Structures are given as structure tokens and as C-alpha cells.
Design an enzyme around this catalytic site. Sequence first.
Site, PDB file in Angstrom:
ATOM      1  N   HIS A  78       0.846  -1.227   0.000  1.00  0.00           N
ATOM      2  CA  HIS A  78       0.000   0.000   0.000  1.00  0.00           C
ATOM      3  C   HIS A  78       0.870   1.263   0.000  1.00  0.00           C
ATOM      4  O   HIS A  78       0.516   2.241  -0.725  1.00  0.00           O
ATOM      5  CB  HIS A  78      -0.986  -0.017   1.172  1.00  0.00           C
ATOM      6  N   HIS A 235      -8.993  -1.790  -5.162  1.00  0.00           N
ATOM      7  CA  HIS A 235      -7.976  -2.132  -4.150  1.00  0.00           C
ATOM      8  C   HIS A 235      -6.986  -3.160  -4.724  1.00  0.00           C
ATOM      9  O   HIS A 235      -5.782  -3.055  -4.464  1.00  0.00           O
ATOM     10  CB  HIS A 235      -8.616  -2.616  -2.833  1.00  0.00           C
ATOM     11  N   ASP A 239      -3.003  -2.696  -4.919  1.00  0.00           N
ATOM     12  CA  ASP A 239      -2.031  -3.750  -4.515  1.00  0.00           C
ATOM     13  C   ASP A 239      -1.062  -4.059  -5.656  1.00  0.00           C
ATOM     14  O   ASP A 239       0.151  -4.156  -5.382  1.00  0.00           O
ATOM     15  CB  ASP A 239      -2.718  -5.051  -4.126  1.00  0.00           C
ATOM     16  N   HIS A 262      -0.445 -11.564  -4.805  1.00  0.00           N
ATOM     17  CA  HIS A 262       0.977 -11.218  -4.540  1.00  0.00           C
ATOM     18  C   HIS A 262       1.896 -12.306  -5.126  1.00  0.00           C
ATOM     19  O   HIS A 262       2.912 -11.939  -5.739  1.00  0.00           O
ATOM     20  CB  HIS A 262       1.208 -10.941  -3.040  1.00  0.00           C
TER      21      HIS A 262
HETATM   22  C1  LIG Z   1      -7.753  -6.984   4.641  1.00  0.00           C
HETATM   23  C2  LIG Z   1      -7.921  -8.014   5.727  1.00  0.00           C
HETATM   24  C3  LIG Z   1      -8.454  -7.645   6.959  1.00  0.00           C
HETATM   25  C4  LIG Z   1      -8.609  -8.586   7.971  1.00  0.00           C
HETATM   26  C5  LIG Z   1      -9.113  -8.252   9.114  1.00  0.00           C
HETATM   27  C6  LIG Z   1      -9.720  -7.951  10.093  1.00  0.00           C
HETATM   28  C7  LIG Z   1     -10.511  -7.726  11.088  1.00  0.00           C
HETATM   29  C8  LIG Z   1     -10.356  -8.334  12.334  1.00  0.00           C
HETATM   30  C9  LIG Z   1     -11.253  -8.063  13.367  1.00  0.00           C
HETATM   31  C10 LIG Z   1     -12.309  -7.180  13.164  1.00  0.00           C
HETATM   32  C11 LIG Z   1     -13.320  -6.852  14.241  1.00  0.00           C
HETATM   33  N1  LIG Z   1     -12.756  -6.466  15.544  1.00  0.00           N
HETATM   34  C12 LIG Z   1     -11.791  -5.366  15.392  1.00  0.00           C
HETATM   35  C13 LIG Z   1     -11.366  -4.844  16.760  1.00  0.00           C
HETATM   36  O1  LIG Z   1     -12.507  -4.393  17.487  1.00  0.00           O
HETATM   37  C14 LIG Z   1     -13.426  -5.460  17.711  1.00  0.00           C
HETATM   38  C15 LIG Z   1     -13.889  -6.026  16.374  1.00  0.00           C
HETATM   39  C16 LIG Z   1     -12.466  -6.582  11.919  1.00  0.00           C
HETATM   40  C17 LIG Z   1     -11.573  -6.853  10.889  1.00  0.00           C
HETATM   41  C18 LIG Z   1      -8.237  -9.910   7.751  1.00  0.00           C
HETATM   42  C19 LIG Z   1      -7.699 -10.329   6.536  1.00  0.00           C
HETATM   43  C20 LIG Z   1      -7.520  -9.427   5.493  1.00  0.00           C
HETATM   44  C21 LIG Z   1      -6.942  -9.875   4.176  1.00  0.00           C
HETATM   45  O2  LIG Z   1      -5.838 -10.390   4.150  1.00  0.00           O
HETATM   46  N2  LIG Z   1      -7.661  -9.708   3.067  1.00  0.00           N
HETATM   47  C22 LIG Z   1      -7.214 -10.131   1.749  1.00  0.00           C
HETATM   48  C23 LIG Z   1      -8.184  -9.602   0.694  1.00  0.00           C
HETATM   49  C24 LIG Z   1      -7.839  -8.157   0.375  1.00  0.00           C
HETATM   50  C25 LIG Z   1      -6.945  -8.197  -0.853  1.00  0.00           C
HETATM   51  N3  LIG Z   1      -5.538  -8.147  -0.504  1.00  0.00           N
HETATM   52  C26 LIG Z   1      -4.949  -7.079   0.024  1.00  0.00           C
HETATM   53  O3  LIG Z   1      -5.541  -6.044   0.285  1.00  0.00           O
HETATM   54  C27 LIG Z   1      -3.475  -7.217   0.286  1.00  0.00           C
HETATM   55  C28 LIG Z   1      -3.271  -8.253   1.376  1.00  0.00           C
HETATM   56  C29 LIG Z   1      -3.441  -7.465   2.663  1.00  0.00           C
HETATM   57  F1  LIG Z   1      -4.737  -7.591   3.087  1.00  0.00           F
HETATM   58  C30 LIG Z   1      -3.126  -6.019   2.299  1.00  0.00           C
HETATM   59  N4  LIG Z   1      -2.917  -5.969   0.838  1.00  0.00           N
HETATM   60  C31 LIG Z   1      -7.250  -9.522  -1.543  1.00  0.00           C
HETATM   61  N5  LIG Z   1      -8.015 -10.304  -0.579  1.00  0.00           N
HETATM   62  C32 LIG Z   1      -8.535 -11.509  -0.815  1.00  0.00           C
HETATM   63  O4  LIG Z   1      -8.559 -12.001  -1.932  1.00  0.00           O
HETATM   64  C33 LIG Z   1      -9.113 -12.275   0.338  1.00  0.00           C
HETATM   65  C34 LIG Z   1     -10.250 -13.230  -0.006  1.00  0.00           C
HETATM   66  C35 LIG Z   1      -8.871 -13.780   0.335  1.00  0.00           C
HETATM   67 ZN   LIG Z   2      -4.073  -4.474  -0.217  1.00  0.00          ZN
END
Ligand SMILES: Cc1cc(C#Cc2ccc(CN3CCOCC3)cc2)ccc1C(=O)NC[C@H]1C[C@@H](NC(=O)[C@@H]2C[C@H](F)CN2)CN1C(=O)C1CC1
Ligand SMILES: [Zn+2]
EC number: 3.5.1.108
Length: 297
Positions: A78, A235, A239, A262
Site C-alpha cells: 500500500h 484495491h 495492490d 501477490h
Molecule cells: C484486509 C484483511 C483484513 C482482515 C481483518 C480484520 C478484522 C479483524 C477483526 C475485526 C473486528 N474487531 C476489530 C477490533 O474491534 C473489535 C472487532 C475486523 C476486521 C483480515 C484479513 C484481510 C486480508 O488479508 N484480506 C485479503 C483480501 C484483500 C486483498 N488483498 C490485500 O488487500 C493485500 C493483502 C493485505 F490484506 C493487504 N494488501 C485480496 N483479498 C482476498 O482475496 C481475500 C479473499 C482472500
Molecule cells: Zn491491499
Amino acid sequence: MIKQRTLKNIIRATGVGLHSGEKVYLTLKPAPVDTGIVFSRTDLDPVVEIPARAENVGETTMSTTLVKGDVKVDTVEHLLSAMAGLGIDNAYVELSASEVPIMDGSAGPFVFLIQSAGLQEQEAAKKFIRIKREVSVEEGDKRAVFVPFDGFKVSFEIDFDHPVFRTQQASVDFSSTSFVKEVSRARTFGFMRDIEYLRSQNLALGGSVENAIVVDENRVLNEDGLRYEDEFVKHKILDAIGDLYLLGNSLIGEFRGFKSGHALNNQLLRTLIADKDAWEVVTFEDARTAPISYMRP
Ligand SMILES: Cc1cc(C#Cc2ccc(CN3CCOCC3)cc2)ccc1C(=O)NC[C@H]1C[C@@H](NC(=O)[C@@H]2C[C@H](F)CN2)CN1C(=O)C1CC1
Ligand SMILES: [Zn+2]
């Protein structure tokens, strides 16, 4: 001539690593001509510096990681996306921990911090990798392609079998469409079941609705919704722009991703670099006749 640029001023920022959940202090520093982008782990003694280049990419599973021995810098794509989009050639990126801070999940905070500090033109020609031949890689149903193109452009398609998936294709020519306005604000995203599983594997520890589009089986849980109708594919483009900057020079050509990530983006970079018939390094004594152009610094 098109000149190399760095930062006019140093930029400081604070955030959390998406995966680590750690608080991290980021400093972006001006850098000399021909430095490139260099990540610096300043929590270590001695300080470990990893050039942002294809040859220094590690695991690639969760995100784009730079590695040198047993030292890593997680989630560079990013910030590299932000620098790519403003045409920054040379900068030191200092980190107080293993992971770049996720900020709002987009490149927007990075582009704002960089443009506030302003850019400095340097007395040296900017070098471009010009795509001369089509270079494609496939694995299973995923494909990533370089295609010659008198400019810079990124086309991307995804296909989630999911009620939320709105447009799954987009194409942006960055010589005529604003990276800043149309792409930089596009946020990373996670599906609830994935998030629950990764949390349970001590991953995604910094994740929140503050830095990610959180999707359950049906809808975006984020109260204020999406920034673009096509935010998810936008997005993916952001990336890809980040990963493309690991070439170490700005691109004149077109990138096309079909469900790519990636790992396949990295294979494409290695395959391009390895097929020297498919690309050349060019400079431009005259910006007025060049295929790409830059904002005033
Ligand atoms: C973004 C994210 C967020 C969370 C998360 C989270 C989360 C955890 C907890 C809460 C809730 N909690 C938070 C704390 O307060 C209490 C509630 C909310 C969100 C967990 C995982 C991920 C993730 O890896 N997403 C991949 C996604 C995004 C994209 N890739 C990118 O964007 C690249 C990789 C990296 F992502 C940054 N660049 C391609 N893609 C896919 O194809 C996925 C389907 C496979
Ligand atoms: Zn990303």
C-alpha cells in the site's frame, strides 16, 4: 528531461500492523539519486535495510513481505502503491517494527503525508522499464500479464461468488485518470469467516472496520459503507501497483490481472526481469513527448 524525485521533507506516521497488531512508528526520509525505495528496521541493532526489489520478496501468502536473513518487513504494497502513484524514485522508509502500519486500509493516508511534505526533483534522469513484448504467467484459473502500452495502465478482474460482488472488473489509464482520486482511497477487505480463522491462527491482530471493509455472507458491515461502487477491484489495482514498484523502476506498459495476487504478481515480475527481450530501460530528455507524465512536485 524527466528527473528522479524524492521527498522534499521527512514524514512521520503512527499506526498498527494488520497482521502483527503492533503499534509502529513510520518515518519516510529523502534519499539520494539511484537509492530506490529502501525499508529500514530501526528497532534492530544493527539497523537492517531491505531494498524494495523483486529479489527480496519472501512468503507472499498474507501480503507483500521483504526479507533479508531472518529479518522481515510485512505488508509493503500500500505504501509502495502510494510512492509508485506519485512517481517517488528514492526514499528511506524507517519502521519501529516488522510491519508497515495499515492506516485506513488504503494508500490515501500515505499519499496525503507524502504530498504535504512535497516532492524534490533531483539532477538525474528517471529510468523507465518499457514493456516491449507480452509477458504472461498462469497458474490454475489465475493469470497476470504485461502488454506493451505507450503509457501506464492496470486492468483487473476478480470473481467472488458472493452477494456483494457490484463491479468485479476495472481498467485505469493513469496518464488520463487520477491514481489519487480514483484508486488511492480503495480499502483492503476481509470476509468474516476468513477473519475468524486467521484471528484463531494469531493473524489479522490489527484488523478493524477502521482499516478494512469487513464482509459477512451478504453485506459490508462497515457502518459508512464503500468509498467506490467497485472498491474491491480498485484495491486489487492498488495492490498490483505496489507489487509492480518492486521492479525498482517505473513501468511504461499495461498490467492485466485475472484473480491474481501477490504470489502470481511476483512470478510475473521475475519472468519479466528474466526475459530481457521483453523490456528495455528508457529515459526521456523531453517530458512533452513522453508517453507518461507527472504532477508538479
Ligand atoms: C484486509 C484483511 C483484513 C482482515 C481483518 C480484520 C478484522 C479483524 C477483526 C475485526 C473486528 N474487531 C476489530 C477490533 O474491534 C473489535 C472487532 C475486523 C476486521 C483480515 C484479513 C484481510 C486480508 O488479508 N484480506 C485479503 C483480501 C484483500 C486483498 N488483498 C490485500 O488487500 C493485500 C493483502 C493485505 F490484506 C493487504 N494488501 C485480496 N483479498 C482476498 O482475496 C481475500 C479473499 C482472500
Ligand atoms: Zn491491499
